Write a protein that binds this ligand. Structure first.
Ligand SMILES: Nc1ccn([C@@H]2O[C@H](CO)[C@@H](O)[C@H]2OP(=O)(O)O)c(=O)n1
Length: 124
């Protein structure tokens, strides 16, 4: 199996690079992280910060989650992220993405003990 917390790291953490390196980035990473195995995951954000920095977000600004739950938190500082969005030529199993680097606040849902990120909700 895989815990919620490990799945979050798998799907959203990329501390080895500080920015969306190339135009190839999303195509390479979505595949690599197994996010295009059952279908082409539509949108997925990678965070280029240390894991400790991202976990710290669970003690930052408490905001409502898009689903109405209240266990979402917004980072006080902007972070380096790469946004991956599915293109048109993208036809499963040949998923195609547009790589987009940006610096924004991230909003994650947290839970458990230790209280850690389990879902990426939004970037603002
Ligand atoms: N800016 C966004 C919005 C959504 N997602 C991911 O796409 C899913 C569908 O919105 C979200 O739940 C989240 O993945 P996950 O919940 O698995 O962290 C993301 O990575 N980045």
């Amino acid at each position: 199996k895989e815990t919620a917390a490990a799945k979050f790291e798998r799907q959203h953490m990329d501390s080895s690079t500080s920015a969306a390196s190339s135009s190839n980035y999303c195509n390479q990473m979505m595949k690599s992280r197994n996010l295009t195995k059952d279908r082409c995951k539509p949108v997925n954000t990678f965070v280029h910060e240390s894991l400790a920095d991202v976990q710290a977000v669970c003690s930052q600004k408490n905001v409502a989650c898009k689903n109405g739950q209240t266990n979402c938190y917004q980072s006080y500082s902007t972070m380096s992220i790469t946004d991956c969005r599915e293109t048109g030529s993208s036809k499963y199993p040949n998923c195609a993405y547009k790589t987009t680097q940006a610096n924004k606040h991230i909003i994650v849902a947290c839970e458990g003990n230790p209280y850690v990120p389990v879902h990426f909700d939004a970037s603002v």
